[PDB]
Amino acid sequence: ETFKEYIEKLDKLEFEKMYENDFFLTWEKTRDELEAVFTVADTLRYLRENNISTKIFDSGLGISLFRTRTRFSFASACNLLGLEVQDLDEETVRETANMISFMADIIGIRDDMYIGKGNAYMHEVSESVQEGYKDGVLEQRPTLVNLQCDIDHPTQAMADALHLIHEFGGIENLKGKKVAMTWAYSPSYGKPLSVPQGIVGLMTRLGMDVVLAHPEGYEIMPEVEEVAKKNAAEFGGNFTKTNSMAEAFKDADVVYPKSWAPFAAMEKRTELYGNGDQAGIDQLEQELLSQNKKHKDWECTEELMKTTKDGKALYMHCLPADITGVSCEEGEVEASVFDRYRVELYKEASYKPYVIAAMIFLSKVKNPQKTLTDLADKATPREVK
Residues that bind a copy of itself (CB under 8 A): 48-49, 53-61, 68-69, 72, 75-76, 79-80, 82, 84, 86, 88-89, 91-92, 95, 98-100, 102-103, 105, 132, 135-139, 319-320, 326-327, 342-343, 346-347, 349-350, 353, 364-365, 371, 380-384
Instruction: Please tell me the number of Cα atoms within 13 Å of 105 on its side-chain side.
Output: 23
* Least spacing, CB of residue 365 vs a copy of itself, in Å: 6
Nearer to a copy of itself, 80 or 224 (CB): 80
**Coil, strand or helix: which one is 85?**
strand
* Least spacing, CB of residue 48 vs a copy of itself, in Å: 7
Answer yes or no: are the C-beta atoms of 187 and 328 closer than 8 Å.
yes
Nearer to a copy of itself, 49 or 310 (CB): 49
* Least spacing, CB of residue 292 vs a copy of itself, in Å: 23
**Coil, strand or helix: which one is 334?**
strand
* Least spacing, CB of residue 311 vs a copy of itself, in Å: 22
Q: How far apart are CA 102 and CA 14, in angstroms?
A: 31
Nearer to a copy of itself, 69 or 123 (CB): 69
Q: How far apart are CA 214 and CA 379, in angstroms?
A: 49
Nearer to a copy of itself, 103 or 281 (CB): 103
Q: How far apart are CA 9 and CA 371, in angstroms?
A: 15
Nearer to a copy of itself, 264 or 326 (CB): 326
Nearer to a copy of itself, 97 or 248 (CB): 97
Q: 76-85 burial string, b = 16+ CB within 10 Å, else e?
A: ebbebbbbeb
* Least spacing, CB of residue 26 vs a copy of itself, in Å: 22
Q: How far apart are CA 273 and CA 117, in angstroms?
A: 11
Q: How far apart are CA 70 and CA 99, in angstroms?
A: 24
Q: How far apart are CA 60 and CA 234, in angstroms?
A: 42
* Least spacing, CB of residue 94 vs a copy of itself, in Å: 8
**Coil, strand or helix: which one is 362?**
helix
Q: Which residues contact 1 (CB under 8 A, 6 or more apart)?
A: 42, 46
Helix (H) or strand (E) holding 181: strand 178-182
* Least spacing, CB of residue 318 vs a copy of itself, in Å: 11
Nearer to a copy of itself, 131 or 219 (CB): 131
Nearer to a copy of itself, 88 or 233 (CB): 88
Q: Which residues contact 367 (CB under 8 A, 6 or more apart)?
A: none
Strand partners, 323: 333
Q: Where does 56-140 have alpha helices with state H?
A: 69-81, 92-99, 117-134
Answer yes or no: are the C-beta atoms of 175 and 376 closer than 8 Å.
no
* Least spacing, CB of residue 317 vs a copy of itself, in Å: 11
* Least spacing, CB of residue 88 vs a copy of itself, in Å: 7
Nearer to a copy of itself, 309 or 382 (CB): 382
